[PDB]
Amino acid sequence: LARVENLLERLLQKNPVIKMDDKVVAEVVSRNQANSFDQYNYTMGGAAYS
């Protein structure tokens, strides 16, 4: 059972840090904001950028 403990310790070594990308998050946020902007423009007729 000692090697089970050794493997569990080695598996506890792993850093609990999960790097998450920022460029894709920004692009998705921009797309959703654009959807909201288009909705608001449509509800205002055409008195906006387009």
Partner 1 sequence: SYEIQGSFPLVELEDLGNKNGLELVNLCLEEFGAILFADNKKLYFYDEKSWYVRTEKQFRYLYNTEEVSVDTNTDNLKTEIKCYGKQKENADKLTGDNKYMAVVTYTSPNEAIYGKRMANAKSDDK
Partner 2 sequence: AILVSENGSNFKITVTNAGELKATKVE
Chain residues binding partner 1 by CB under 8 A are 38, 41-42, 44-47, 50
* CA 17 vs CA 3, 13, 14, 20: distances in Å: 26, 12, 9, 9
Counting Cα atoms < 13 Å in the Cβ hemisphere of 23 gives 0
Contact 36, 43 (CB under 8 A): no
CB-nearer residue toward partner 2: 34 or 48: 34
Q: Would you count residue 7 as binding a second copy (CB under 8 A)?
A: no
Q: Which does 41 bind (CB under 5 to 8 A by kind): partner 1, a second copy, partner 2, none?
A: partner 1
Q: Which residues bind a second copy (CB under 8 A)?
A: 22-23, 25-30, 32-33, 36
